[PDB]
């Protein structure tokens, strides 16, 4: 039978609404199950209004069979088929006939059909129309009356699911789905009925009970429902906490919802230390895409619920915590979840209320800590307390004494030997310093000297046990702390003391190399240089422009080291082969080179005085890098060279234009040959290459007129290869570069005319080739813009030269028959008059980009329809725009609700 199903599937793929526009349903008039399975298969071959009215033929027979047949397998199959086709069957059939009553009385109460029957009702609940309001109300009230008998509220759904059979678990899931969907789409319908409120409480009670099922999927469904309900009630009246109607109706059970939320809170990402299944405390090692989304939903729900009632949230939390300190419920799981909840509602709340809540929370946590002696408990408590103080910079910035105590204890934790406590401490140290910079540098109340100095004077001891990654983390934190010091005369000394330890190591290594360069081949020396350069990169990332004070100190030695490592690795590769790059020592040297380039790129991207950058830093970099990049084989070419060139060109523009020819002489031709041959070989080099090309085109276009034309040929060839590419991102970048290049070249007279005569027809031919080929339909707007631009330039007469070399002819007419011939070649079946009309319209629309786009799209769509080809992807950008608009709207809404985003996530950093 499988072969028949596959053959029918393939036949359906061959344009069902054209080749087979439902007739087989007649055969069901013992065989009905075969029909139902066939349509079940068809239900996924279907992806608007695909002649959907003929689904009524399915529904009529389904009602007939449903109303009259007792064959349980057949009933199940028919119910499944209807479950699929409720997405399209006309509404005037489902809501008018005996359907709802028929299955709610005849099947929903029967185990053989319970799950499918409830799923069918879920799909009916999924219909979202203002019509049939009374039928929806009847559906919900009757379904509740049924499932009340079938699953009484007194049942402990947690236990029933945990020990329940597979079908029972599926029934619990389907009940959750039905309740969630129906209340989402019709709660206002139910709430408007005074007498039904008790049944609404029954639904809410079911939601509470089913929310306690452990399995992640069930709780995800319940959480989505709770998120919807909380959002709706919050938006009913978000400014206060008399009660509005809906909130008044839901309040009698909101408390249980908050208790559920706090009890079951998922792990935040910032918590590195977790309890392992074997009963021990360890650092986290894996992540799940489910966890992040579940945590985000959990945070949304709980922040909405807190906005609904602040006092009650405080009460709940403070009581759970008072309980766990008392030892009534002491357990790492409970404390972890409670502290995750305490940190998750960070923000929101209010200022004085947050202070009041956190004072008691910190007191209770400290006492709990001071009571538990076991090392595992001491780690769990420390981790949780770190998470709390990490998520509440608002509290810290108002209490200097506590902030200093937290920082000192965090340093004490940095020495703690436990697996993940050090990482927790350093990550929290960033989260503190980043969001509380000014307090560290400004002399606070009572103290004599800024806290940054107590850090720097003891930095070596503070970093006397850290893993190198944690060392870079800590240096980045200190970098943020210094970065806020506005006084340059003090910031320079702070930087010098700040960098003093790695600068000492650097000076030692440089002195050793000067005495003998062979030291650079020692793996330990290379590793230390890599660590120092990573520290410098992170410090530059933090401090920003003032980092030049440190950078200029070591710049020349850094480039000398780069040259020495370049020579070493190049000689090694030349002597022993390309695979030499795989050796750990060679990889470490390449890491040193990569970090040098990254440091320069990082500093330049934040520099604000391009003149001095061009004068001092650029020429040594070019001398040290370009020849190496040209000479090395692909296996040893650093893509960070291209990235740095992109960044430097972007920042400097006209100040570096004179150097562009050399850069292209060294890089361009060498790198291009690596990209073209095989697409996947060097994705990073490809990306950095097109970044460089876009930057130089945008900010240093005159360079293209300086380089020899034989190489500008390669530039245009690379751009054309770029937009003809298959992958979306590279094609988009190619189109952007092409359009910018046209705009730029339009401004230089002789260059404009020569470029037109040499390439205009080639570029147009390639653009129409890609458009007709449709291989990159997503960029059709850019294609329309480019085509319109060229059509305008020719139409306005700005192309003074005759495009045809051999024929004295008008440019407009010439381009007209040229594009007509091109279109005819692409699609030989097009008629002459059709193409003539299309080209005349297209030319007439050169002045209006949206109109041009829609004209071209309509022409291409009718070509597809002649070919019978799918037109869905030809509107892909529009649908993508819709998705982006929806996402941006959601983001816009979330920022309006305090607490949904972490204090370390909002761009709107409050003062201090
Ligand atoms: C409790 C253990 C402790 O802090 N001190 N025990 C002593 C004191 N004197 C002599 C002998 N033993 N404990 C565990 N964790 C914390 C704690 C952690 C943090 C954080 F920054 F790491 F999150 C901060 C603080 C605070 F509130 F700043 F004190 C305490 N305390």
Domain ranges in the chain are 1-89, 397-498
The tokens describing 843, both together, are 């030319």
Which technique was the structure solved with, according to the deposited record?
cryo-EM
Calculate how far, in angstroms, residue 455's C-alpha sits from the geometric centre of ligand 1. Answer: 19
Look up the CATH number of domain 397-498: 1.20.1440.250
Q: How far apart are the first and last CA of the chain?
A: 72
Atom of ligand 1 lying closest to residue 387 CA: 23
CA–centroid distance, 407 to ligand 1, in Å, is 11
Helices (H), 415-457: 421-435, 437-441, 451-456
Residue of 369, 404, 432 to mutate, ligand 1, most atoms within 8 A of C-beta: 369
How many whole angstroms separate alpha carbon 668 and alpha carbon 663? 7
Angle, alpha carbons 872-784-870 (nearest 5°): 15
Name which residue sits closest to atom 24 of ligand 1, judged by CA.
406
Ligand 1 atom with the smallest distance to the CA of 382 is: 15
Alpha carbon dihedral 477, 482, 483, 485, in 10-degree steps, equals 150
Cα gap 103→118, rounded to integer Å:
9
| Structure tokens that stand for 123 in this block | 């799909």
Ligand 1 probe mutation, 385, 391, 413, most atoms within 8 A of CB: 385
CA angle 803, 805, 807 (to 5 degrees): 95
Q: Is 622 exposed, middle or buried (0-12, 13-18, 19+ CB in 10 A)?
A: middle
Q: Which two tokens stand for residue 36?
A: 């139902």
342 Cα: distance to centroid of ligand 1 (angstroms): 18
CB 100 within 8 A of CB 124: yes
Distance, CA of 738 to CA of 813 (rounded, Å): 25
Compute the distance from residue 443 Cα to the ligand 1 centre, in Å.
24
Residue closest via CA to ligand 1's atom 7 equals 370
Residue 67 Cα distances to 57, 107, 339, angstroms: 15, 11, 56
Angle, in degrees to the nearest 10, between helices 216-236 and 166-191:
10
From CA 316, how far away is CA 687, in angstroms rounded?
Answer: 52
Which of 281, 362, 364, 366 to probe ligand 1 with, by most ligand atoms within 8 A of CB? 366
Determine the residue of 281, 379, 382 to mutate for testing ligand 1's pocket, defined as the one with the most ligand atoms within 8 A of the Cβ atom.
Answer: 382
Cα 373 to ligand 1 centre (Å): 12
What token pair was written down for 69?
């047949």
Atom of ligand 1 nearest to the CA of 390: 23
Helix (H, G, I), strand (E, B) or coil at 237: coil
Q: How far apart are alpha carbons 77 and 40 in whole angstroms?
A: 9
Residue environment code for 50-85, b if the CB has 16+ CB neighbours within 10 A, otherwise e: eeeeebeebbebbbebbeeeeeeebbbbbbbbbbbb
**Tokens at 794, concatenated:** 């020719």
Q: Measure 313 CA to ligand 1 centroid, in angstroms.
A: 26
Asked if residue 681 lies in contact with residue 647, where contact means CB atoms within 8 angstroms, the answer is no
The closest residue, in CA terms, to atom 20 on ligand 1 is 386
Please give the distance, rounded to the nearest whole angstrom, from the Cα atom of residue 10 to the centre of ligand 1: 68
CA of 413, closest atom in ligand 1: 22
Helices 488-498 and 548-576, interaxial angle, to 10°? 40
- Residue located nearest, by CA, to atom 25 of ligand 1: 406
What CA–CA distances, in Å, run from 631 to 218, 414, 567, 638? 60, 46, 11, 12
Q: What spacing in Å lies between the alpha carbon of 388 and ligand 1's midpoint?
A: 13
How many Å lie between the centroid of ligand 1 and the Cα of residue 378? 9
Cα separations in angstroms, 571 against 60, 509, 526, 561, 631? 81, 22, 17, 15, 11
Ligand 1 centre to CA of 654 (Å) is 56
Residues 138-164 as b/e (b if ≥16 CB within 10 A, e otherwise) read ebbbbbbebbeeebeeeeebeebbeee
What's the Cα-to-Cα distance from 264 to each of 216, 298, 352, rounded to whole Å?
A: 11, 9, 27
Enumerate the H helices of 484-638 as residue ranges. Answer: 488-498, 500-515, 523-543, 548-576, 584-606, 610-612, 618-631
Q: Which one, of 771, 716, 767, lies nearest residue 744 by Cα?
A: 716
Q: Which two tokens stand for residue 791?
A: 């059509």
**Which residues contact ligand 1 via a Cβ below 6 A?**
362, 366, 369-370, 381-382, 385-386, 389, 405-406, 409-410, 413
Nearest CA to ligand 1 atom 12: 370
Ligand 1: centre distance to CA 363 (Å)? 11
Going from the Cα of 366 to the center of ligand 1, the distance in angstroms, rounded, reads: 7
Atom of ligand 1 nearest to the CA of 389: 23
The DSSP letter of residue 330 is -
Report the C-alpha gap between 1 and 630 in whole angstroms. Answer: 63
Rounded distance from Cα 498 to ligand 1 centre (Å): 27
Q: Resolution of this PDB entry, in A?
A: 3.4
The C-alpha atoms of residue 584 and residue 607 are separated, in whole angstroms, by: 34
């Amino acid at each position: 039978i499988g072969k028949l199903n596959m053959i029918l599937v393939q036949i359906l793929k061959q344009e069902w609404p054209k080749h087979w526009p439902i007739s087989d349903i007649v055969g069901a008039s013992s065989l009905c199950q075969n029909n139902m399975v066939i349509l079940k298969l068809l239900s996924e071959e279907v992806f608007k209004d695909s002649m959907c009215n003929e689904f009524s033929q399915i529904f009529q027979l389904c009602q007939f069979v449903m109303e009259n047949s007792q064959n349980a397998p057949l009933v199940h199959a028919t119910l499944e088929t209807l479950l699929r086709f409720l997405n399209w069957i006309p509404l005037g059939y489902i809501f008018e006939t005996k359907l709802i009553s028929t299955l709610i009385y005849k099947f929903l109460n029967v185990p053989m059909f319970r799950n499918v029957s409830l799923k069918c009702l879920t799909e009916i609940a999924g219909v979202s129309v203002s019509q049939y309001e009374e039928q929806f109300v009847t559906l919900f009230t009757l379904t509740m009356m049924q499932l009340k008998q079938m699953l009484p509220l007194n049942t402990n759904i947690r236990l029933a699911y945990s020990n329940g059979k597979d079908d029972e678990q599926n029934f619990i899931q389907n009940l959750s789905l039905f309740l969630c969907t129906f209340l989402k789409e019709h709660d206002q319908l139910i709430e408007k009925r005074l007498n039904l409120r008790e049944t609404l409480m029954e639904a809410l009670h079911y939601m509470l009970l089913v929310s306690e099922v452990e399995e992640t999927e069930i709780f995800k469904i319940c959480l989505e429902y709770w998120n919807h309900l909380a959002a709706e009630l919050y938006r009913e009246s978000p400014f206060s906490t008399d009660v509005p109607p809906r909130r008044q109706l839901y309040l009698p059970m909101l408390f249980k919802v908050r208790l559920l939320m706090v009890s079951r809170m998922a792990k935040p990402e910032e918590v590195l230390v977790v309890e392992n299944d074997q009963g021990e405390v360890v650092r986290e090692f894996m992540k799940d895409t489910d966890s992040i989304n579940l945590y985000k939903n959990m945070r949304e729900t709980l922040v909405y619920l807190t906005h609904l009632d602040y006092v009650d949230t405080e009460r709940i939390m403070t009581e759970k915590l008072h309980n766990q300190v008392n030892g009534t419920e002491w357990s790492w799981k409970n404390l972890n979840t409670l502290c995750w909840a305490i940190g998750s509602i960070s923000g929101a709340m209010h200022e004085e209320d947050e202070k009041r809540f956190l004072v008691t929370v910190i007191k209770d946590l400290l006492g709990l800590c001071e009571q538990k002696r076991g090392k595992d408990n001491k780690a769990i408590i420390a981790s949780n307390i770190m998470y709390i103080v990490g998520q509440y910079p608002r509290f810290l910035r108002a209490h200097w004494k506590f902030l200093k105590t937290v920082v000192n204890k965090l340093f004490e934790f940095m020495h703690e030997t436990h697996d993940g406590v050090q990482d927790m401490a350093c990550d929290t140290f960033i989260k503190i310093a980043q969001k509380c910079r000014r307090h560290f540098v400004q002399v606070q109340v009572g103290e004599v000297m800024p806290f940054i100095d107590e850090i720097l004077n003891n930095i070596n001891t503070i970093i006397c046990d850290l893993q190198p990654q944690q060392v870079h983390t800590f240096y980045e934190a200190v970098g943020y702390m210094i970065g806020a010091q506005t006084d340059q005369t003090v910031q320079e000394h702070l930087i010098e003391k700040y960098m003093l330890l790695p600068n000492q190591v650097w000076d030692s290594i440089i002195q050793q190399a000067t005495k003998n360069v062979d030291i650079l081949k020692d793996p330990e020396t290379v590793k230390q240089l890599g660590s120092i350069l990573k520290t410098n990169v992170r410090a530059c990332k933090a401090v920003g422009h003032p980092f030049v004070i440190q950078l200029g100190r070591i710049y020349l030695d850094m480039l000398n080291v780069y040259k020495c490592l370049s020579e070493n690795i190049s000689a090694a590769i030349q002597a022993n082969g390309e695979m030499v790059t795989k050796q750990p020592l060679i990889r470490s040297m390449r890491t040193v080179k990569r970090e040098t380039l990254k440091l320069i790129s990082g500093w330049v991207s934040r520099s604000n005085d391009p003149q001095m950058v061009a004068e001092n830093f650029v020429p040594p970099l070019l001398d040290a890098v370009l020849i190496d990049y040209q000479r090395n084989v692909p296996a040893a070419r650093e893509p960070e060279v291209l990235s740095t060139m992109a960044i430097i060109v972007n920042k400097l523009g006209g100040h570096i234009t004179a150097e562009i020819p050399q850069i292209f002489d060294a890089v361009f031709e060498c790198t291009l040959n690596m990209i073209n041959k095989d697409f996947e070989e060097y994705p990073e080099h490809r990306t950095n290459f097109f970044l460089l090309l876009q930057a130089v085109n945008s900010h240093c276009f005159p360079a293209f007129l300086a380089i020899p034309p034989t190489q500008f040929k390669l530039v245009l060839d690379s751009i054309i290869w770029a937009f003809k590419h298959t992958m979306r991102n590279v094609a988009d970048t190619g189109l952007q570069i092409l359009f910018t290049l046209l705009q730029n070249v339009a401004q230089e007279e002789a260059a404009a005319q020569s470029f037109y005569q040499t390439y205009f027809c080639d570029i147009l031919q390639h653009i129409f080739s890609v458009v007709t080929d449709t291989s990159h339909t997503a960029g059709l707007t850019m294609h329309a813009s480019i085509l319109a631009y060229m059509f305008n330039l020719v139409e306005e007469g700005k192309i003074s030269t005759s495009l045809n070399p051999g024929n004295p002819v008008n440019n407009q007419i010439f381009l007209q028959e040229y594009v007509a011939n091109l279109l005819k070649s692409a699609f030989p079946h097009l008629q002459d008059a059709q193409v003539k009309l299309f080209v005349t319209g297209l030319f007439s629309l050169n002045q209006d980009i949206p109109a041009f786009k829609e004209h071209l799209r309509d022409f291409l769509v009718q070509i597809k329809e002649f070919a019978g080809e799918d037109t869905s992807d030809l509107f892909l950008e529009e649908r993508e725009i819709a998705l982006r608009q929806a996402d941006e709207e959601k983001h816009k809404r979330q920022m309006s609700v305090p607490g949904i985003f972490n204090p370390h996530e909002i761009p709107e950093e409050m003062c201090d």
